[PDB]
Design a protein around this nucleic acid. Structure first.
Ligand SMILES: [Zn+2]
Ligand SMILES: [Zn+2]
Ligand SMILES: [Zn+2]
Ligand SMILES: [Zn+2]
Lengths: 89, 89
DNA sequence: ACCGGAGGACAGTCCTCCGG
DNA sequence: TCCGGAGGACTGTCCTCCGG
């Protein structure tokens, strides 16, 4: 089943043979089969672990700071910004 | 297709007839077909939105509580109590 | 009666690779 | 060449209701 890295990236049929394969072989490229990427399980128990801890950190957050701040953090991607937020106390 | 509240809790086969079904007519029972109860979507995109929020709060709380059992706190249910606690900031 | 879990239709993923 | 998105095997859900 697994297509080689390059065929994946390019989205063309892979011959998939061993070691290399038609277009990496032909075209002159180093053909690889990368490991599947580890992702979190998409189960319902796990979505619920995570929604319900996020909820409880939100509940605790609100005893400490205003709701308007909740909404800012819940969007920040930068670690300086998450820290500065906290520094304006 | 939908089974009745009761056949649902008792786990027996439901006749499904409306308004009152098999048993619920028999045992002269309060027969409800309660509406289809919502869950949040199990999709990858939504698992991931929620995991990004949780990470950001998780990070914000590493700085509020650099010292431990945040989990102790996360389990409490009382608002006064939690706030009595935190005022040991 | 009661309820753990089998059974199965279905929701939605997460791959490959076709074709504009 | 290139990538949107179709195709479709599959993972895991989430019902019902069997039979112990
Ligand atoms: Zn290939
Ligand atoms: Zn290759
Ligand atoms: Zn019924
Ligand atoms: Zn009924």
């Amino acid at each position: 089943e697994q297509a080689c890295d390059i065929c994946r990236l390019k989205k063309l049929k892979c011959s998939k043979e061993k070691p290399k394969c038609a277009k990496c072989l032909k075209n002159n490229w180093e053909c690889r089969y990368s490991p599947k990427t580890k992702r979190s399980p998409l189960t319902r128990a796990h979505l619920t672990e995570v929604e319900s801890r996020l909820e409880r950190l939100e509940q605790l957050f609100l005893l400490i700071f205003p709701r308007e701040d909740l909404d800012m953090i819940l969007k920040m991607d930068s670690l300086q910004d998450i820290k500065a937020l906290l520094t304006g106390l």
